[PDB]
Design a protein around this nucleic acid. Sequence first.
RNA 1: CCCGUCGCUAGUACCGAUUGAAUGGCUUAGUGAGGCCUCAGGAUCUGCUUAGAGAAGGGGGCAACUCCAUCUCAGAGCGGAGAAUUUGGACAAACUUGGUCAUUUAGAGGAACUAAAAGUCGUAACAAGGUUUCCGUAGGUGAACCUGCGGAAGGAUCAUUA
RNA 2: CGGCACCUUACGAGAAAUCAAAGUCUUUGGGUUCUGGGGGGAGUAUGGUCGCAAGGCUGAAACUUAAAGGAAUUGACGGAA
RNA 3: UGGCCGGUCGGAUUUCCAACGGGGCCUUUCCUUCUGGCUAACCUUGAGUCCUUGUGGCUCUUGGCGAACCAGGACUUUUACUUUGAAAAAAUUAGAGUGUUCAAAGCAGGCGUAUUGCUCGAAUAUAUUAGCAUGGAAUAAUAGAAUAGGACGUUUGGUUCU
RNA 4: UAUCUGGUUGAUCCUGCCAGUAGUCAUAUGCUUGUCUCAAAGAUUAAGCCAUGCAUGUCUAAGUAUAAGCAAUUUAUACAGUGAAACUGCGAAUGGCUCAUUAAAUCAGUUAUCGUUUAUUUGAUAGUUCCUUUACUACAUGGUAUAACUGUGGUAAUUCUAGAGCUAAUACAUGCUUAAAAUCUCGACCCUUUGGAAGAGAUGUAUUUAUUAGAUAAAAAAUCAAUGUCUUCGGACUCUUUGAUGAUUCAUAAUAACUUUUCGAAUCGCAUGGCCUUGUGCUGGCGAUGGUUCAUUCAAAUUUCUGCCCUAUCAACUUUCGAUGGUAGGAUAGUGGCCUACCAUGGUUUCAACGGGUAACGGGGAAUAAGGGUUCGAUUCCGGAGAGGGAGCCUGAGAAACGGCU
RNA 5: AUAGAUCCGUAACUUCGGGAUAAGGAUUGGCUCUAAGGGUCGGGUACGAUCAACUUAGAACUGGUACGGACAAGGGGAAUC
Lengths: 155, 260
Amino acid sequence: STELTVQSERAFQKQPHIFNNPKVKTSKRTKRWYKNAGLGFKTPKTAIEGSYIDKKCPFTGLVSIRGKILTGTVVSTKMHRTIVIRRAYLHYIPKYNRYEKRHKNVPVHVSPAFRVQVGDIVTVGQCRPISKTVRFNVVKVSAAAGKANKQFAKF
Amino acid sequence: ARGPKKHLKRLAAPHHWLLDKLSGCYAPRPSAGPHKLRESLPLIVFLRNRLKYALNGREVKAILMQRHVKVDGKVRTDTTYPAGFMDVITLDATNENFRLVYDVKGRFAVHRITDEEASYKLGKVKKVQLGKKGVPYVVTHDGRTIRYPDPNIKVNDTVKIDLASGKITDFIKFDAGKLVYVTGGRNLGRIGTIVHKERHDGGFDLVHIKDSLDNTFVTRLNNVFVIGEQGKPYISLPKGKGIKLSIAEERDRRRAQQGL
RNA sequence: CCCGUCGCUAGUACCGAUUGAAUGGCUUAGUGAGGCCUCAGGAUCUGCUUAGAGAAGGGGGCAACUCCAUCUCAGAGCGGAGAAUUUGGACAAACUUGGUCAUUUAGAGGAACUAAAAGUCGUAACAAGGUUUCCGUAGGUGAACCUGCGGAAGGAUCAUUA
RNA sequence: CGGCACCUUACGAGAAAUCAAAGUCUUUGGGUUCUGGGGGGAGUAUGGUCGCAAGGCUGAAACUUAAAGGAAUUGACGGAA
RNA sequence: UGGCCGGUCGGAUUUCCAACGGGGCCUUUCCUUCUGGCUAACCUUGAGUCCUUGUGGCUCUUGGCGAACCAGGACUUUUACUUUGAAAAAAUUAGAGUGUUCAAAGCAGGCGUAUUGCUCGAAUAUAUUAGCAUGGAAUAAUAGAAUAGGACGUUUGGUUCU
RNA sequence: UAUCUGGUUGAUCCUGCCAGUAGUCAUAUGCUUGUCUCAAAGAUUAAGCCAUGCAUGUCUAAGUAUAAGCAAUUUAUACAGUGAAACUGCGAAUGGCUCAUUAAAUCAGUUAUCGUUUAUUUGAUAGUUCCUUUACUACAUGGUAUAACUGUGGUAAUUCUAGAGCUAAUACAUGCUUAAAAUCUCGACCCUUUGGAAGAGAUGUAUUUAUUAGAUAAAAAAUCAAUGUCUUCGGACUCUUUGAUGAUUCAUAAUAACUUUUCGAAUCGCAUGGCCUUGUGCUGGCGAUGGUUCAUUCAAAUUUCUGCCCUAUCAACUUUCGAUGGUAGGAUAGUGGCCUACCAUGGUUUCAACGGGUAACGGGGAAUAAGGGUUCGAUUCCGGAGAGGGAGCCUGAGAAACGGCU
RNA sequence: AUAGAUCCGUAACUUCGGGAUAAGGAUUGGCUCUAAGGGUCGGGUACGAUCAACUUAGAACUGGUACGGACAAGGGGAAUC
Ligand SMILES: [Mg+2]
Ligand SMILES: [Mg+2]
Ligand SMILES: [Mg+2]
Ligand SMILES: [Mg+2]
Ligand SMILES: [Mg+2]
Ligand SMILES: [Mg+2]
Ligand SMILES: [Mg+2]
Ligand SMILES: [Mg+2]
Ligand SMILES: [Mg+2]
Ligand SMILES: [Mg+2]
Ligand SMILES: [Mg+2]
Ligand SMILES: [Mg+2]
Ligand SMILES: [Mg+2]
Ligand SMILES: [Mg+2]
Ligand SMILES: [Mg+2]
Ligand SMILES: [Mg+2]
Ligand SMILES: [Mg+2]
Ligand SMILES: [Mg+2]
Ligand SMILES: [Mg+2]
Ligand SMILES: [Mg+2]
Ligand SMILES: [Mg+2]
Ligand SMILES: [Mg+2]
Ligand SMILES: [Mg+2]
Ligand SMILES: [Mg+2]
Ligand SMILES: [Mg+2]
Ligand SMILES: [Mg+2]
Ligand SMILES: [Mg+2]
Ligand SMILES: [Mg+2]
Ligand SMILES: [Mg+2]
Ligand SMILES: [Mg+2]
Ligand SMILES: [Mg+2]
Ligand SMILES: [Mg+2]
Ligand SMILES: [Mg+2]
Ligand SMILES: [Mg+2]
Ligand SMILES: [Mg+2]
Ligand SMILES: [Mg+2]
Ligand SMILES: [Mg+2]
Ligand SMILES: [Mg+2]
Ligand SMILES: [Mg+2]
């Protein structure tokens, strides 16, 4: 994500305490801070080489992934840098020795290192409270094919 | 609500204190100290209930204010001072030293040690960290900050504290094949050697421990306390050696010991 | 055997004019105490101080524009604490009016149901119950009901390749 | 092969009448939807909604009651043969 | 489980074995690797079958499948299910021990010489779902290679990064 | 501890309910009541109202004693024993009661703080104190200002207090002495450059900002710009120091400063040793109480996942006036629409959202026990909430406290 | 008495069109600003000059809380015949 207007806000978007010295020209252009989130979650090369800021990103931001590592189907990418995932499960009623389908809607912050859409299976990880309802970041996206390569028209 | 709690209800006490259900509504709430409230044994419970040296709590106070008891070489005149695991209790009158180690049923045992063993204790390293002015310190399981440790000392190691000058005499690493004293859970009080440590990056590293009778059991690493090598422990083990006989073998021992 | 109308008696709910009444929420709007934060205020109650009598070497010094110093009173030297009061905020009790929701209840009178079996009138149903019954719909009638149209048999026909 | 049905039997089922499904059910589980919980009050009151209306769909409670009912047997009775 | 020298007046033992229950290996064998040491039950075996038997002893073996696991992996189809294990406070429930004189209960108590006191205890189970770790891979879903944007790799280029 | 029986009929077989029957840590009531052990008990209705009395105070050798208190003669004409009062300190935030509110709220099991505060305990910890050093003011130890007390009063009344005179501190406010070096910065005297030095200031720890380090899978070579420690100027070059986590802008260290400048002992008891220039000189023990920071303990606050009764005669709700999100600020102890400003138009729902009821506090648990279940849980343990209803705050580590205040 | 305009809010009943300006409630000046809402002018066989109108929304400041400052300008509700 090296484009689409990083400085789109009234404040200068920068990573805090990362200093680009203008007197000595750095050998690498526009020094970027990144980290591995841990738990075998690979920092994407878009996070490493991008130009976005996202202070709530799990790789280039100031949040840490710790706690639950959940997985869910994306049902809504209609916010800016926040998605809603569906965590469908099954609840056991012990009287009838049977289960019932249930679901929970979890709002998750998404970094612009990840391009997600409705239908993707994402792996999310618990962070500190990001907003009123968001306590998770997307740390992994698990839809590469998605059966979306053969639907297009032919001759 | 509204502040710190100062009363411990009887039936809210730790079960290993073995307080009777009747005879009072309250239990001795331990003071703040080196050990956690549910993993410690107050001096009133040790003196009045275990040793039976006092009949009341008034007599426990009368014992302690003559500076008779001392825990880890210091006097500790509090009635509910939290004497926890590894703690050496010296009674200078009666000329005896106790080490607060668990029995295999999960309870603090009356374990008399010698005056040589009363000159030291063992401590599980809780953190190794750099303090102010760049000085490394190590924190044991009983709240002791010990400055300038050995650089080979890591977390989950066991140091040997000298109790007069509280320094590290030596230490034991956390490797496979070293003795464990299990200090928490339903396997509490058991003694065995590490088969291997199962990692689980993210939380709750597990330890597979095998005792002298080849019975393996899995325990979280919060409850594992290294006490020595394969065999030859650095402390003196209590009577029973952390074996956990089953209840059939326990009644077999009782019928083989009471019939003469 | 049974069915209704009407008739006394008792009970139970329903409709009911009363902008019915009451309680409890929530709430728009208006007024808005109090403490807290804040802009001011400065009763006092003070330590040092004077370039002016201040009846006091400016503390190594009363000639190199130079080595921390007090008292009556005026202060032109300051500095601190600081009460009443007060400005603006946010929190906001509580009151007034209006809204709506939940619950309870008075009510002249009306229309029902039950107790309920015996009263008056008829005999609708049960037999081909004397017009086979019953369903839907529509109209009519003191009442059970009757009549039309379509249906059913739970019919009084399992049947006329006679 | 598919269909509307029918006759005999009762393996079986059923309280029985009867049923080749109403069988494969106390030896209880092929899949699924809807409905009922003693008789009345009552398909009533009220609310919602649909309709031009008639009404349709949804739909109580207070109260009352020891039976109401289903199938069959014997009798009696029939303006039934 | 025993199963037989019954030599302890119907009580050790066990390739004498059968029925169970596991783990490997080979049968075209589906599960990963690469960085550096553990020098595999030293793949091998100079020393040697001195030990006598047969086959239960092959050793300081010449570098040795350096593979007996530690951390950053060209490293990742996801679930349900079920086994096991940590956790699910005590009291309570079930329950072991113990003549509160019995019992409900309680966690006591028992044994000498009562003279310098000895000592067993305060077990165990269940605690349902969800979370954690783990074994299985049936059952029931789920995904892959079809305009090949498919796999590998002992090929050979190129770009770019560390 | 797997059980049925009476009632529809003239009799029958059913459906079907009524009735029986047996428990209740399940309440009330009637009659009766001798003994032993054990024991609930104003929850239901009215979280309605309260007369009275009590329930929170506390002193050791070790903060302050001139009681004009009591008692005793001793290193004791500074005090010395005990000690009302009162100041200071600590506690009053625990306990106890109740279940009114409350339906993803509380709560349960499970996480998280790499998102924070934390008295006390326990362990560790402080030679740096000078305003602009060539202008220091006691450290054998600074200051005033108050209670108690004395004395004069007001009010009918209160745990009301006023004016005057005293006097303390571990109260309040100031303030000081403890190396010896290194490293920076400034720097009057190095001329032919790879050419340096006195003597001045600064560097503890807190606070705030900015910057830097906090490394690391393996191996060689090539000119150079200038050399870098030292040359046998061929150029030898070895070594620089790096902890922790799954993970960090972590721990920690360094640089430039900043600050209505935080801490860095003007405190108390007991014992009175040791040394020689015998000065009441220099040293010196065991404690108590303080104290900054870290760690620990007791916690607290927030938080992940999943789980709650009845109701559709509650199907759409939220977004005016924060509803979902982004950016920035403010606020907080800290995350966060917690609040503000500017943008975006989101967020929940037939897998039952939102609303309504609850004679609902949640749970461990309890009654009944073939198995499955059904019902209860105000109530002795855990968690929440509340003190007549609301709101606001003070002090404090901790309260939105009510035996605190407005 | 109410009254213009802007924003909020609006019941019974209904012939579903209304009732409705229901009822009921806030704001309104001046000054200094801010932000949106246009027309014409150029391309390789991503952007600027230039011109102009009054609408709307917001903010600060300000005053003897005044402001539809004169004028102008509905009173409303429950019912019956
Ligand atoms: Mg935000
Ligand atoms: Mg409490
Ligand atoms: Mg205590
Ligand atoms: Mg009338
Ligand atoms: Mg007739
Ligand atoms: Mg007829
Ligand atoms: Mg056929
Ligand atoms: Mg019924
Ligand atoms: Mg109907
Ligand atoms: Mg109706
Ligand atoms: Mg019928
Ligand atoms: Mg019949
Ligand atoms: Mg018994
Ligand atoms: Mg009869
Ligand atoms: Mg009954
Ligand atoms: Mg007697
Ligand atoms: Mg009373
Ligand atoms: Mg009461
Ligand atoms: Mg005080
Ligand atoms: Mg204290
Ligand atoms: Mg900020
Ligand atoms: Mg923020
Ligand atoms: Mg806002
Ligand atoms: Mg309640
Ligand atoms: Mg049963
Ligand atoms: Mg409950
Ligand atoms: Mg309860
Ligand atoms: Mg109640
Ligand atoms: Mg409680
Ligand atoms: Mg409270
Ligand atoms: Mg009261
Ligand atoms: Mg109150
Ligand atoms: Mg306090
Ligand atoms: Mg209060
Ligand atoms: Mg009280
Ligand atoms: Mg209280
Ligand atoms: Mg109007
Ligand atoms: Mg009108
Ligand atoms: Mg204005």
